[PDB]
Amino acid sequence: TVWGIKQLQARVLAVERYLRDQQLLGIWGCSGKLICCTNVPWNSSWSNRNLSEIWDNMTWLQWDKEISNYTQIIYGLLEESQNQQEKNEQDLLALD
Amino acid sequence: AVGIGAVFLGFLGAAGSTMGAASMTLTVQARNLLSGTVWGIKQLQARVLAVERYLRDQQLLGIWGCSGKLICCTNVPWNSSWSNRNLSEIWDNMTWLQWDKEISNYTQIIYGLLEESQNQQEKNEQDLLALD
Amino acid sequence: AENLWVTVYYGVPVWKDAETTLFCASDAKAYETEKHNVWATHACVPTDPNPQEIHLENVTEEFNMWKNNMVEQMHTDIISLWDQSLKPCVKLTPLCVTLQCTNVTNNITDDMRGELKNCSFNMTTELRDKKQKVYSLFYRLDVVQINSNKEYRLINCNTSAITQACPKVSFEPIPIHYCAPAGFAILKCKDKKFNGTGPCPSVSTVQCTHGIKPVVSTQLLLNGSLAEEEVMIRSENITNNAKNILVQFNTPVQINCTRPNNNTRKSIRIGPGQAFYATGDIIGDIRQAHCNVSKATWNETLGKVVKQLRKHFGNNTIIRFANSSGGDLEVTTHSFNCGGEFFYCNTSGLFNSTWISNNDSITLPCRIKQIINMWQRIGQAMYAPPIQGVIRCVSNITGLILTRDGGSTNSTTETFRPGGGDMRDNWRSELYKYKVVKIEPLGVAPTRCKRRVVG
Amino acid sequence: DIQLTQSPSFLSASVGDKVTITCRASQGVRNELAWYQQKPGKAPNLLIYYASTLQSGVPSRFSATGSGTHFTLTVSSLQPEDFATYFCQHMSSYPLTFGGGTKVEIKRTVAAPSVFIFPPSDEQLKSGTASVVCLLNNFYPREAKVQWKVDNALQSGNSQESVTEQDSKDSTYSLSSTLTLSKADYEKHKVYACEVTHQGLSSPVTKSFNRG
Amino acid sequence: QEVLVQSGAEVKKPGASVKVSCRAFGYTFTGNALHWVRQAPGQGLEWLGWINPHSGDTTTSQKFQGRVYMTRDKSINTAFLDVTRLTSDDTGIYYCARDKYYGNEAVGMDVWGQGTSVTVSSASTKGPSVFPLAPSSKSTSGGTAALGCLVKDYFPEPVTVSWNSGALTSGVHTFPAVLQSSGLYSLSSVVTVPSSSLGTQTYICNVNHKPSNTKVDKKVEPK
Ligand SMILES: *[C@@H]1O[C@H](CO)[C@@H](O[C@@H]2O[C@H](CO)[C@@H](O[C@@H]3O[C@H](CO[C@H]4O[C@H](CO[C@H]5O[C@H](CO)[C@@H](O)[C@H](O)[C@@H]5O)[C@@H](O)[C@H](O[C@H]5O[C@H](CO)[C@@H](O)[C@H](O)[C@@H]5O)[C@@H]4O)[C@@H](O)[C@H](O[C@H]4O[C@H](CO)[C@@H](O)[C@H](O)[C@@H]4O)[C@@H]3O)[C@H](O)[C@H]2NC(C)=O)[C@H](O)[C@H]1NC(C)=O
Ligand SMILES: *[C@@H]1O[C@H](CO)[C@@H](O[C@@H]2O[C@H](CO)[C@@H](O[C@@H]3O[C@H](CO[C@H]4O[C@H](CO)[C@@H](O)[C@H](O)[C@@H]4O)[C@@H](O)[C@H](O[C@H]4O[C@H](CO)[C@@H](O)[C@H](O)[C@@H]4O)[C@@H]3O)[C@H](O)[C@H]2NC(C)=O)[C@H](O)[C@H]1NC(C)=O
Ligand SMILES: *[C@@H]1O[C@H](CO)[C@@H](O[C@@H]2O[C@H](CO)[C@@H](O[C@@H]3O[C@H](CO)[C@@H](O)[C@H](O[C@H]4O[C@H](CO)[C@@](*)(O)[C@H](O)[C@@H]4O)[C@@H]3O)[C@H](O)[C@H]2NC(C)=O)[C@H](O)[C@H]1NC(C)=O
Ligand SMILES: *[C@@H]1O[C@H](CO)[C@@H](O[C@@H]2O[C@H](CO)[C@@H](O[C@@H]3O[C@H](CO)[C@@H](O)[C@H](O)[C@@H]3O)[C@H](O)[C@H]2NC(C)=O)[C@H](O)[C@H]1NC(C)=O
Ligand SMILES: *[C@@H]1O[C@H](CO)[C@@H](O[C@@H]2O[C@H](CO)[C@@H](O[C@@H]3O[C@H](CO)[C@@H](O)[C@H](O)[C@@H]3O)[C@H](O)[C@H]2NC(C)=O)[C@H](O)[C@H]1NC(C)=O
Ligand SMILES: *[C@@H]1O[C@H](CO)[C@@H](O[C@@H]2O[C@H](CO)[C@@H](O)[C@H](O)[C@H]2NC(C)=O)[C@H](O)[C@H]1NC(C)=O
Ligand SMILES: *[C@@H]1O[C@H](CO)[C@@H](O[C@@H]2O[C@H](CO)[C@@H](O)[C@H](O)[C@H]2NC(C)=O)[C@H](O)[C@H]1NC(C)=O
Ligand SMILES: *[C@@H]1O[C@H](CO)[C@@H](O[C@@H]2O[C@H](CO)[C@@H](O)[C@H](O)[C@H]2NC(C)=O)[C@H](O)[C@H]1NC(C)=O
Ligand SMILES: *[C@@H]1O[C@H](CO)[C@@H](O[C@@H]2O[C@H](CO)[C@@H](O)[C@H](O)[C@H]2NC(C)=O)[C@H](O)[C@H]1NC(C)=O
Ligand SMILES: *[C@@H]1O[C@H](CO)[C@@H](O[C@@H]2O[C@H](CO)[C@@H](O)[C@H](O)[C@H]2NC(C)=O)[C@H](O)[C@H]1NC(C)=O
Ligand SMILES: *[C@@H]1O[C@H](CO)[C@@H](O[C@@H]2O[C@H](CO)[C@@H](O)[C@H](O)[C@H]2NC(C)=O)[C@H](O)[C@H]1NC(C)=O
Ligand SMILES: *[C@@H]1O[C@H](CO)[C@@H](O)[C@H](O)[C@H]1NC(C)=O
Ligand SMILES: *[C@@H]1O[C@H](CO)[C@@H](O)[C@H](O)[C@H]1NC(C)=O
Ligand SMILES: *[C@@H]1O[C@H](CO)[C@@H](O)[C@H](O)[C@H]1NC(C)=O
Ligand SMILES: *[C@@H]1O[C@H](CO)[C@@H](O)[C@H](O)[C@H]1NC(C)=O
Ligand SMILES: *[C@@H]1O[C@H](CO)[C@@H](O)[C@H](O)[C@H]1NC(C)=O
Ligand SMILES: *[C@@H]1O[C@H](CO)[C@@H](O)[C@H](O)[C@H]1NC(C)=O
Ligand SMILES: *[C@@H]1O[C@H](CO)[C@@H](O)[C@H](O)[C@H]1NC(C)=O
Ligand SMILES: *[C@@H]1O[C@H](CO)[C@@H](O)[C@H](O)[C@H]1NC(C)=O
Ligand SMILES: *[C@@H]1O[C@H](CO)[C@@H](O)[C@H](O)[C@H]1NC(C)=O
Ligand SMILES: *[C@@H]1O[C@H](CO)[C@@H](O)[C@H](O)[C@H]1NC(C)=O
Structure with missing residues (x-):
């Protein structure tokens, strides 16, 4: 019966959107949600702002509008340069 | 010789490469595993099984002593009956496709020694060690 | 140390042959053709602008074009497409009235054997009372007499129901890319010489196949992908004279087909709501449809095939070509669609030759049928609505479907005839280089690594 | 840079011969060395890498040896398609360099050239230049000398030569020598002669004409 | 692939x-x-x-x-x-x-x-001047005669040269172009033929140069 199938396709994309973020959150050096750190230097070309000028003078909506141009670049430096080189380093360090 | 750095082979790139060489491309096959009226319902049922196949592997990857993806170690001795090959004879002389064809017979046995003997006995050991 | 320990790897290139549910893809301009959903492209996924082909170096995978399930999936898809496309269309149930027909207006001879008939009959109007004395123009293959004037009937009224194709949709074959869901992949064979069965040296993987137009035809494979270098000969069993022989061409054969009849579309109203599109009078001369093939191109193409046929039937052997044995009209003639009409051409002028070990056009008689029952389907009969004006089309002859006789006398000469029937063979000519695999990213391997003790 | 020296520069051999060509490096390059085949008008094809490993699809009659500063490539039995130029290349440090090439040509019986001289056309003379052409047809071996004489005065600097590649069928060469003069200088002399020296000739051959 | x-x-x-x-x-x-x-x-x-x-x-x-x-x-x-x-x-x-x-x-x-x-x-694009290399009148009786075309002062490479529109190929030598001191290319194309054929068989060299889109047919006959 239709109209009941309208919400099914919505409830399928909701979990696809969740695991999409969870897969990205897992392949990075995080998995554990909420907050996590990384060993990637912040390139100055990505809107050179200050520490006290971002967390005490900017909203997340206003911030995402500026970094939207470099969001896709940063994502690449997190999955490849890190947990593929960091975990492989751990395989060499855990055998001894 | 001279070199200009690492290169990239793509999805299933190192399929014909040795297991040791193909272990560097683990984060590539993991990336494209999830990827983000009738005839429109045909793709829905496909996109449902895709995530069922993902959580199936993720549940197995979680109940074992791993959860953290890509690579992980275990405390299970490799039984010699499972095709006694050497360390330098597997990672530097065998592809993952050729390897899975031989170990396919013992894949289901190994899975049982990972979920039961380990994280059920290892985590229970941790409950006894964390109370003191 | 030296005693090994198992280690779990996630994301390993490990796949096994399997079957899954493939989805579609058909560009973004194909959706711009609109015209109230032509063919299929309505909720089909737009094709990836930059498709990727990862060449799997050192990888050798065995393909099987005759046991490939992508064909069995595509055939059932086009059939359901046909039924779904005729569901909201006008049903011609009250068209089985007695037809008092006569010859079309022309001037003899007695060998014209009519073909076109001028039929008059009663018809239901919008109202459920007063009748309607209207006339139409049907082909000889669509009607059949039954025993004052000479009395006919529709050829399907004694077989199954009948539905009229809506004039909004079109039968234009548009490129459709077949893609595999997440966790699955489609392998592509990249060798220039490959008979569809066996291990493939240069294998690459893709997510979506190339644009494959669903062209429904018999005997002559039209608008397909041309083969590389020398022409290819593919068959499930060469020794078996019961298995069809799919041929693939290197150079396309220019074929020209026309419908020399300026038809007129009479839109009689069988209300309320429904409306039937009859055939009015014909503007001009009474001519029959025909297809032209350049004798020069066809001579070279046939000589390239028989030289490849001798690689399987002896180096010094005589190969003779003969036309079809008999049966249904869809098997003995070159059935195809052009401009909405369904042509049925005589291929007795194409398969009339005899080749030993060592400037104009070939016209072929083409008939036209409107009421069809394709795919061996009984219960669903389609009335193709008439098309106004002369229809012209130029296509590419890219392959054949041949069958071999059993009369033998095997080591002497061999005779090949055009075949078909099963349209599943038509998909195999494009899906011969593709197969579905399952990804099993879980692979265990031993190494000198042990975990901790939470020290 | 590192210099690679190949020897010989031109090797003559018959179909069926076993031949070895040499590549020497000015510094040690370990085993990091490749061999290529190149034919006129075509890109090179890789034969050997790691100094001794055969590239996929290369015929087994090719082999190679060496390490350090001394490398060789051997063909166990030459076939007609193997007569070509061969290059060695090192990759041990920047910049990558190639050897000067070794051209392998087919031996055949000695054949003397047929010699023809062509005066300039009147059409060319109208435009202010005169070209005199001396043709040497179908000779072997390649070594030949062409000298131009104008009124018994030896010419230098006003001629250019072109030589064909060894003919694929008969294994001969052909050569053109072209003398270019202004119209004024051309008409200021009478006797134009080209003298050809080749070991297949019992005696040097002179072909000449008198202007007019 | x-x-x-x-x-x-x-x-x-x-x-x-x-x-x-x-x-x-x-x-x-x-x-x-x-x-x-x-x-x-x-x-x-x-x-x-x-x-x-x-x-x-x-x-x-x-x-x-x-x-x-x-x-x-x-x-x-x-x-x-x-x-x-x-x-x-x-x-x-x-x-x-x-x-x-x-x-x-x-x-x-x-x-x-x-x-x-x-x-x-x-240099900037120029089609060749094509001049006859006329067969010697002293050509050997019952012997072999040589004739040709001088293809001079063109830029850049290449030219294509045929004889009798492709009907004559045996014995043809089309020499590699040489770069002249002027900066324009030059070559000769020669062919050897039976002396009995001089005057009886017409010889035309066809010289095409695509950069300048030029095509030249030069008849070469005894002078
Ligand atoms: C598709 O498949 C193909 C084929 O399966 C595959 O091609 C192989 O790729 C691998 C890389 O993944 C190549 O492996 C490298 O080989 C290097 C070659 O170096 C040594 O080679 C000399 C010859 O060794 C031969 O020895 C014998 C005969 O005795 C022969 O039978 C062998 O099988 C072997 O080929 C070797 O002699 C030479 O040694 C120098 O030093 C010694 C002293 O030690 C001296 O005596 C010698 O005279 C010489 O001066 C040379 O060292 C090898 O160097 C290289 O190893 C480096 O990397 C590893 C890490 O991987 C380091 O640990 C190591 O220390 C080195 O630094 C590496 O092993 C292989 O050659 C290719 N070809 C094959 C197998 O035929 C493709 O990669 C595949 N592609 C894909 C996409 O899957
Ligand atoms: C298939 O068969 C059908 C028959 O069912 C044919 O249809 C008939 O075609 C004929 C043509 O041959 C039609 O006959 C013509 O009818 C015209 C209608 O008259 C109108 O005008 C008058 C005033 O003049 C009005 O009073 C009247 O109400 C109409 O509005 C006539 O005008 C025609 O006359 C012409 O031809 C005759 C021929 O002798 C000349 O003498 C006249 O001078 C004049 O030029 C003509 O009589 C007939 O009406 C059609 N019937 C139907 C039901 O449509 C199809 O043509 C046929 N098709 C094929 C392909 O075979
Ligand atoms: C309307 O249709 C009728 C058909 O009945 C048609 O009349 C027919 O014409 C043909 C020729 O056009 C006649 O056939 C002839 O038969 C005799 C033998 O009895 C032959 O000798 C004739 O040959 C001559 O005509 C040929 C025509 O192509 C020439 O090519 C040839 O070189 C000869 O000169 C010819 O075959 C037939 O007998 C008549 N039929 C009747 C019943 O009269 C009529 O022409 C058509 N008219 C229109 C306007 O369409
Ligand atoms: C039937 O076969 C003919 C060839 O005999 C097909 O014509 C060819 O169509 C292709 C594309 O389908 C053309 O390729 C194009 O080349 C240009 C060159 O710049 C490029 O810009 C385009 O992107 C495209 O790749 C090809 O030129 C054309 N042949 C000629 C002579 O023009 C024809 O499409 C076939 N008809 C079918 C399959 O229905
Ligand atoms: C099927 O139809 C196509 C076109 O509908 C035919 O191709 C056409 O071939 C003719 C030659 O008979 C071409 O005509 C002329 O060619 C000359 C060059 O010699 C040129 O000077 C003219 O201007 C004109 O082009 C015509 O262009 C060409 N059409 C196309 C679209 O390419 C084909 O021959 C037909 N096949 C058969 C078997 O009848
Ligand atoms: C269309 O229907 C009419 C009826 O209105 C038919 O006319 C009758 O035909 C029968 C024989 O078929 C005669 O006996 C009657 O006298 C006719 N007139 C009436 C009933 O009023 C007409 O023949 C039908 N036309 C067809 C079937 O083509
Ligand atoms: C429906 O009608 C068609 C056409 O009249 C029938 O087809 C005929 O089948 C018989 C089989 O014995 C053949 O001999 C005829 O030649 C066929 N006719 C044509 C025109 O092809 C068909 O059999 C009928 N179906 C029934 C009565 O169920
Ligand atoms: C398709 O081509 C393959 C070759 O790759 C054929 O396999 C060979 O078949 C011949 C006989 O036809 C055997 O002698 C070989 O041993 C086969 N080789 C391998 C590797 O199996 C295959 O038979 C061809 N298929 C068809 C239907 O002709
Ligand atoms: C297809 O073409 C063939 C040959 O052109 C046709 O065979 C002809 O049949 C008629 C009788 O219907 C004979 O009078 C002719 O002599 C036949 N021609 C030849 C060359 O023998 C055939 O009828 C056509 N139609 C079909 C459906 O096959
Ligand atoms: C196949 O082609 C041949 C011609 O190559 C046709 O032969 C005809 O034979 C009849 C008598 O048997 C002659 O009257 C004709 O003149 C022949 N044709 C030609 C063009 O000369 C043969 O009929 C053809 N077969 C079919 C089935 O069409
Ligand atoms: C087929 O016949 C129709 C008319 O029955 C033609 O349509 C006419 O086309 C011309 C120009 O092409 C227009 O000026 C007329 O107004 C049209 N008539 C009608 C009634 O709309 C059509 O052109 C014919 N087809 C061909 C190919 O000639
Ligand atoms: C930082 O951004 C610039 C572009 O402005 C880029 O050239 C540079 O490579 C980036 N830094 C790194 C480490 O890639
Ligand atoms: C950035 O903020 C720090 C405060 O920790 C301050 O010392 C520094 O001067 C600031 N830089 C600029 C450019 O405002
Ligand atoms: C992002 O890029 C667009 C064009 O690529 C540019 O117009 C815009 O200014 C950029 N965003 C910022 C914050 O500079
Ligand atoms: C190893 O495999 C053998 C079967 O060959 C089995 O009997 C044995 O129990 C296995 N080892 C362990 C520790 O179970
Ligand atoms: C296995 O490999 C090791 C290299 O670490 C070697 O010492 C040992 O001899 C090998 N064993 C066999 C049976 O090849
Ligand atoms: C796996 O088991 C089957 C039968 O159970 C046997 O035929 C096959 O040889 C086994 N695999 C290996 C690699 O020995
Ligand atoms: C129709 O034409 C055919 C042609 O042979 C003829 O046999 C038949 O008698 C004609 N019938 C009528 C009613 O015109
Ligand atoms: C092919 O057919 C022959 C005889 O018709 C049969 O013997 C054979 O088993 C079939 N299958 C093959 C050759 O794979
Ligand atoms: C083409 O067919 C004709 C006869 O239709 C024949 O004379 C000719 O030899 C054929 N062409 C070739 C290349 O054999
Ligand atoms: C048939 O003979 C030809 C030479 O005429 C040869 O090239 C080809 O390989 C042969 N095919 C076979 C023996 O299957």
């Missing part, structure tokens, strides 16, 4: 820049380092540099540093070579060549493009 296809021949004047392209088919473009190698006419092979198509990192031979530039566009599987501040010494055929790149180091160049001819000259 594994091939590199390069852009067509180019002519530029001294001091200008030329951009040549190379597109990879039949393999993963980003999986192998790519070399550029040039060959001056009649000379050997000279390495310019190489690029990693994955990262875009480059190393240039120091002779060309700051003059030759290597780039790539991954989406179209294509590499580009920019050669700037051109002089006549840069004339030659330019190849792209894939390295096997085992161990992520140079091993050998296993697939080569077809090459792109680049000519640097101040």
